[PDB]
Amino acid sequence: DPLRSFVRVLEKRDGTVLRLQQYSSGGVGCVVWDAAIVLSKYLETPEFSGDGAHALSRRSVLELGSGTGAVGLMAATLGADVVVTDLEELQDLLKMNINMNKHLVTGSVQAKVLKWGEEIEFPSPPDFILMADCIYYEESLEPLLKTLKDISGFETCIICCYEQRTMGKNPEIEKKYFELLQLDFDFEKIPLEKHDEEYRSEDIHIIYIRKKKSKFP
Amino acid sequence: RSFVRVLEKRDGTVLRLQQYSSGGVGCVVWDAAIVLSKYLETPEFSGDGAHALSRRSVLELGSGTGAVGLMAATLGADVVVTDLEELQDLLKMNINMNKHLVTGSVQAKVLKWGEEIEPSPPDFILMADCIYYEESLEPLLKTLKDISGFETCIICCYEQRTMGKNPEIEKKYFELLQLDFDFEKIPLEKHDEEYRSEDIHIIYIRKKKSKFP
Amino acid sequence: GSSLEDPLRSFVRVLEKRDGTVLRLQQYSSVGCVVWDAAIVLSKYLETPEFSGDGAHALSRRSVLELGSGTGAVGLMAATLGADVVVTDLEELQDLLKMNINMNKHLVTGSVQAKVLKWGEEIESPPDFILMADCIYYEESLEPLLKTLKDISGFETCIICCYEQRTMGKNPEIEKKYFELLQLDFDFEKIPLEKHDEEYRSEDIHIIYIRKKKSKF
Ligand SMILES: C[S@@+](CC[C@H](N)C(=O)[O-])C[C@H]1O[C@@H](n2cnc3c(N)ncnc32)[C@H](O)[C@@H]1O
Ligand SMILES: C[S@@+](CC[C@H](N)C(=O)[O-])C[C@H]1O[C@@H](n2cnc3c(N)ncnc32)[C@H](O)[C@@H]1O
Ligand SMILES: C[S@@+](CC[C@H](N)C(=O)[O-])C[C@H]1O[C@@H](n2cnc3c(N)ncnc32)[C@H](O)[C@@H]1O
Structure with a gap:
């Protein structure tokens, strides 16, 4: 297959490998x-994993x-019931990658728009919402924040990971994301030292986010 | 201590259930x-790996x-135990008495x-001896319909009684149940070997899923 | 009595018509x-534009018999579309049929009555239409049903049979036999799934147009 060279592999701690196609369809x-x-890789760290059953085992996970x-596929290999979401345009790719990794899924995974x-429609609030590099443009602000507010419950653990970009308007977009996020959420950056020892970078940050509860309507 | 019923778990720890509380x-x-x-602790119900109830949402009626519900919470479930207003103090007392065994969570509600x-459908709904009078019919069934989703496993355990109105109530219950739910009796052989009776039945119940709900 | 003012209310099935109005079908009688x-x-098929046709509805002012x-x-849906309907069943279902007529009589533009x-x-003259939904499931659904169908239908009767295909148990054998007997005195054709209501359809639910044969002798 000509497309086989466009697969990115991601090794798991247990030696198995996730295989992610980066192109499909006529898309x-x-x-x-x-x-x-x-x-x-952070999801596989001992400290995130905990003792006994992995922290994500039998938990509901939504990826934006x-x-x-x-x-979301990593989470599904760790026992979570995952919904991976994106635009209509990415659905074919998501479904392909589910099919390439079916044997590693221990929980469940499905793709939605x-x-x-x-x-x-996703009425019941997930245990976790996961986001990687979703903070980079206009939609990452008010529309992304509205989605987060509407979907999350007060017990939802939201984990946001992004690479800091210094080029162009990106520093102002990043600042604004966090300035607006604090209006409806509390957050804390985790230390670099909690990331996977190899798969980490000083310019890649993991932020824990939780919905704020106001006593007044 | 005077009115405590002791229920031993397979692991050798003990649940202690107060059967009265002061002024209540x-x-x-x-x-x-x-x-x-005891059925919940059977090897076949428990399954492989983590117990079937571990990290699952359980509502008891x-x-x-x-x-x-306390048994379920000691097996790792996130449990809500419910009853009338009048039982809330007893439920909270028994949560406090047994909280050192709870590996999931448990809270009482009316x-x-x-x-x-007053939202998400639970993984399980558990009922023990809830089939015995007028409210066990349409009102209970309405609650079951309102709360359950298509993936909710409803387990209903009841003692069959021949005395009084009970045969009529049991009969009408299963007639009404058939409309919106599928159900099957669990064979007696699957109950705990000791804690079982030919007159005590366990019914698995599941909401019928119309293609056009 | 019950704590509930109308204890059987939650056993009513609601079916929305194309115009938004609702049919209410009680499912418990006693x-x-x-x-x-x-x-x-x-x-819902009876409401499709293609079945409805141009001008007045295809069922308007037509006799309909439901088995x-x-x-x-x-039958009630047909009565809301202008048909003169007789809904029929066993003796034991007459009270339920009459209860459901009363609950929907305000939407009836033709007429409806119940008979054993x-x-x-x-x-007890042949109807313009005979309608059957899920009547092929057990021993009597064969010889006695087909005997009634032949006895009541005329050569101009449009017989429409809808059923959900069941694969468990003795059902496929019952289905086989239904169609082995049906071919003897009737011609029939399955209508394409694409002619069914776009929302209210399923690959496992079939609509069959049936017509009484005329032998030359
Ligand atoms: C930079 S990528 C990150 C992809 C992946 N999370 C990763 O880290 O490898 C941004 C993703 O967000 C999606 N996206 C952008 N705008 C969106 C919107 N308004 N609604 C939903 N998804 C959006 C894009 O299609 C893209 O897949
Ligand atoms: C016979 S007991 C069974 C109690 C317990 N499940 C057991 O088996 O040991 C019936 C329970 O149902 C509760 N109950 C009765 N009617 C009720 C109603 N209408 N709504 C909620 N709970 C009710 C009673 O308060 C009582 O705790
Ligand atoms: C599965 S139901 C379908 C009911 C309805 N048409 C629907 O689709 O919701 C079968 C119906 O056929 C009726 N029936 C079964 N045997 C019959 C017989 N020998 N004569 C008349 N009706 C019969 C039953 O009473 C029942 O109402």
Whole structure:
């Protein structure tokens, strides 16, 4: 197959390997971003995993802006019931990558369309929402934030990973994301030292986010 | 101590269920709750790996002392035990008495059958000896319909009684149940070897999924 | 009595018409009969533009006989489209049929009444239409049903049979036999799935147009 050379492999701690196609269909290319690799590998760290059953085992996980589905697929191999979401245009790629990794899934995974800011069907709030490199343009602001607010419950653990970009308007977009995020959410950056020892970077950040509860309507 | 029913777990720890609280109401641990609680610990129900209930959402209806829901919480479930307003103090007392064994979570709520529900469908709904009077019919069934989703596993354990109105109630229950739900009796051979009776049945119940709900 | 003011309210099945108005079908009388998925498919098929046709509705001012009516869903839908309907079933279902007529009489633009018709018995002029939903499931659905169908239908009767294909148990054998007997006195054709209501359809639910044969001798 000519497309086999466009597969990106991501090794799991247990020696198995996730294989992510980055092009399909008559459609679109999507890279496996470095931020997705960092987040994926973070999910396999002993400290995130915990003792006994992995932290994600039997938990509901929604990924926003999944792209190749890398992160959500990692979560599915760790026992989560995952929904990977993105634009209509990425659905074929997501489904291909589910089919390439079917044997490694220990929980469940399915692909759905979720365009940020649009009305939701996903009524019950997930245990986790995962995002990798979703903070880079206008939609990453108000529409992404609306989706996060509408979907998350007060117990939802939201984990956001992104690579800091210094080029152009990106520093102002990043600042604004976090300035607006704090209006409806509390957040904290985790230390680099909690990331996977190899798959980490000083310019790639993992942020824990939780919905704020106001006592007044 | 005076009114405690002790229920031993397979792992050798013990659930302690107060059957009365000061100024409040009495509620016995019924035989059906014992049968159902022990059934949850059977090897076939528990399954491989983590127990079938671990990290699963469980709602109990007509919890009384909270016996069955507390058993589930000790098996790793996130449990809500429900009953009438009048049983809330007893439920909270029994949560406190057994919280050192809870590996999931447990909380008490009021849920009077047939009333408007205040959201996500649970993985399991458990009922022990809830089939015995008028409210066990349309109101209970309405609650079951309102709360359950197509993937909810409903387990209903009851003691068959020949006395009084009970045969008519049991009969009408299953007639009404058939409309919106599929159900099957679990053979007696699958109950705990000791904690079982030919007169105590365990029914698995599942909501029928129309293609056009 | 019950704590509930109207204890059987939650056993009413609601079916929305194309114009938004709702049909209400009680499913418990004292004896229960649910609204089967086939009844919903066939009911919504009767409302499709192609079936409805141009001008006045195809059923408008036409005689319709329903066999094995149950709740009366399909016959009631036809009555809301202008047909003069008789819904029929066993004696034990008459109260339910009449209850459901009363609950929907305000939407009736033709007419509807309930009668006993137990299959394979002696009949009391041929209708323009005969409708059947999920009537092929057991021993009597064969010789007695088909005998009634032949006895009542005329050469101009449009017989429409809708059913959900069941694969468990003795069902495929019952289905086989239904069609082995049907071919003897009737011609029939399955209508394409694409002619069914776009929302209210399924690959496993079939609509069959049936017509009484005329031998030359
Ligand atoms: C930079 S990528 C990250 C992909 C993947 N998470 C990774 O880290 O490898 C951004 C992703 O967000 C998706 N996306 C962008 N705008 C969106 C919107 N308004 N609604 C939904 N998804 C969107 C894109 O299609 C793309 O797959
Ligand atoms: C016979 S007991 C069974 C108690 C417990 N499950 C056991 O087996 O030990 C019936 C329980 O149902 C509760 N109950 C009865 N009617 C109820 C209603 N209408 N709504 C909610 N709970 C009710 C009672 O308060 C009581 O705790
Ligand atoms: C599965 S139901 C379908 C009901 C309804 N048409 C629907 O689709 O929801 C079968 C119906 O056929 C009726 N029936 C079965 N045997 C019959 C017979 N020998 N004569 C008349 N009706 C019969 C039953 O009473 C029942 O109402």
